[PDB]
Symmetry: C3
């Protein structure tokens, strides 16, 4: 799975979260977000493969991507604790982090 596959999975799963009804689905969808972010952890967007693993421009991508992953884990939390709507509220701000990270590296 390359970078744009996981990001499109994140964006699609966020739509499944806002349209879900129970806590099992939002926990299921958030875990897929964690799964998609886990598979593309070592991946590189098609914009930065010509920039070094030690370059600040791509290490920006490394902190921003793992910042996305830790916010997902905070959202998986409230879904597991039963707070299904605070998780959906946390998933709404998560879409901001997903949208911003995707736009500056997508096409």
């Amino acid at each position: 799975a390359d970078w744009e596959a996981a990001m499109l999975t994140l964006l699609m799963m966020l739509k499944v979260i806002e349209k879900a009804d129970n806590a099992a689905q939002v926990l299921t969808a958030l875990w897929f977000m964690a799964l998609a972010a886990h598979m593309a952890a070592l991946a590189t967007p098609p914009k930065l493969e010509d920039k070094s693993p030690a370059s600040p421009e791509m290490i920006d991508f490394r902190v921003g991507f793992e910042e996305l992953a830790t916010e997902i884990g905070k959202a998986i939390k409230l879904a597991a604790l039963g707070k299904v709507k605070e998780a959906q509220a946390a998933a709404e701000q998560l879409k901001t982090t997903v949208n911003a990270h995707w736009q500056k590296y997508r096409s």
Copy 2:
């Protein structure tokens, strides 16, 4: 995903398993149990972060957590082989391992 997020996912997925009907769901839910246990493999419960990675008290947590993971894989087995109920019977004993591991490290 921290330790208590995965354990609450395990406990919730065990409830989805006993309430499922086919083999695809129990295989789906058991794979999420494997996924939750995989994401929190290197994690540490909020009780032992002040105990060393080489301490016997936390290496107890490392064997007990990976013992949980290998029992999950044995349960993913029977669900994949079509033995949907022997998997649910294996998931019931899996809840014992999940409950015992969670209680001695949860809050």
Copy 3:
């Protein structure tokens, strides 16, 4: 999760893909295929554990297994891009790679 557990998951998820209707399910099922292939990446089939990690017969298994994983990522693509049927067409050829890899290492 051992090797035959993931392969039976792949074979079962391929049946869920051809029977699905939207793009969320096929993306969900394809991500489980990526998940099953990820958990059994370092695993070894019950036929080759008596053959070295540096032997060509098992390194054949290593390239063939990771070739399966990269074809999955190409299938997760079209499902995420909305091309739900080109993904199902890509999942049909994926079953060929799954069947061939499974038969020469299964029992």
